[PDB]
Amino acid sequence: EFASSFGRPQLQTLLKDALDQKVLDQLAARYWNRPIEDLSPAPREPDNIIDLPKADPDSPYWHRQLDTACSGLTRLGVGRLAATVAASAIQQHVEKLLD
Amino acid sequence: DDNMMFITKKMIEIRNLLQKVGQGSTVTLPSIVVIGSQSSGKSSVLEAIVGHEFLPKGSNMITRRPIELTLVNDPEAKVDYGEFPDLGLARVTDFSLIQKTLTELNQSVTDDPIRLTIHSPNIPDLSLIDLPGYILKRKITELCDKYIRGPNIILAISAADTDLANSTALQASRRVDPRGERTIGVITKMDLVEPEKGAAILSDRQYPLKLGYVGVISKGNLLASINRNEKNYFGSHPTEFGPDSGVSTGVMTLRKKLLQVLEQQMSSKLNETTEAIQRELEETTYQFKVQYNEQPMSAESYLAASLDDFKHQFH
CA neighbor of B86 nearest in space, from B63, B62, B105: B105
Give the Cα separation of B136 and B161 in Å (integer): 26
Distances, alpha carbon B116 to alpha carbons B72, B86, B97, B230, B271, in Å: 11, 9, 14, 28, 27
| b/e map B133-159, b = 16+ CB within 10 Å | bbeeeeebeebbeebbeeebbbbbbbb
Beta-strand pair B67-73/B114-120: parallel
DSSP A62-93: THHHHHHHHHHHHTSTHHHHHHHHHHHHHHHH
CA distances from B229 to B28, B201, B220 (A): 39, 20, 15
β-sheet bridge partners, residue B157: B186
Distance CA B155, CA B172 (A): 9
Query: Are B286 and A30 within 8 A, CB to CB?
Result: no
- Distance (Å, whole) CA B149 – CA B169: 14
CB atoms within 10 A of CB A83: 11
Q: Using DSSP, state whether B311 is helix, strand or coil.
A: helix
Q: In what order do the strands lie in the sheet with B128-130?
A: B81-83, B114-120, B67-73, B128-130, B32-35, B153-159, B183-188, B213-215
- How far is Cα B267 from Cα B29, in angstroms, rounded to an integer? 9
User: How deeply is A81 buried, as exposed, middle or buried, from its count of CB atoms within 10 A (0-12, 13-18, 19+)?
Assistant: middle
**With an 8 Å Cβ cutoff, are A65 and B290 in contact?**
no
The CA distance from B301 to B270, in Å, is: 39
* CA distance linking residue B174 with residue B148, whole number of Å: 10
B156, HSE (Cβ side, Cα atoms, 13 Å): 33
Q: Which long-range contacts (CB under 8 A, 24 or more apart) does A13-17 make?
A: A14/A85, A14/A86, A14/A89, A15/A81, A15/A82, A15/A85, A15/A86
Q: Nearest-CA neighbor of B129 among B29, B222, B18?
A: B29
Sequence-ordered list of residues with C-beta below 8 angstroms from that of B259, at least 6 positions apart, any chain: B4, B5, B8, B124, B126
* Breaks after residues in chain B, judged by C–N over 2.5 Å: 109, 135, 219
- Residues sharing a CB contact under 8 Å with residue B169, sequence separation 6 or more, in sequence order: B35, B36, B37, B40, B41, B44, B133, B134, B155, B156, B157, B158
Mutate to test the interface with A, among B278, B279, B281, B286 (most CBs of A within 10 A): B286
Cα distances (angstroms) measured from residue A94 to each of A8, A13, A83, B89, B138: 16, 19, 16, 60, 65
Residue B203 sits at φ, ψ, to 5 deg, of -125, 120
The closest of B254, B266, B245 to B31, measured between CA atoms, is B266
Task: Return d(Cα B253, Cα B248) in angstroms, integer.
Answer: 7
Quick one: resolution in A? 18.8
**CA angle (B160 as vertex; B159, B165 as ends), nearest 5:** 80
Residue A44 to residue B286, Cβ atoms within 8 A: yes
Are B286 and A47 a contacting pair at CB < 8 A? yes
Nearest to B91 by CA among B82, B100, B99: B82
Q: How was this structure determined?
A: cryo-EM
CA distance A78 to A22: 9
Q: Is A59 in the B-facing interface, judged by CB distances under 8 Å?
A: yes
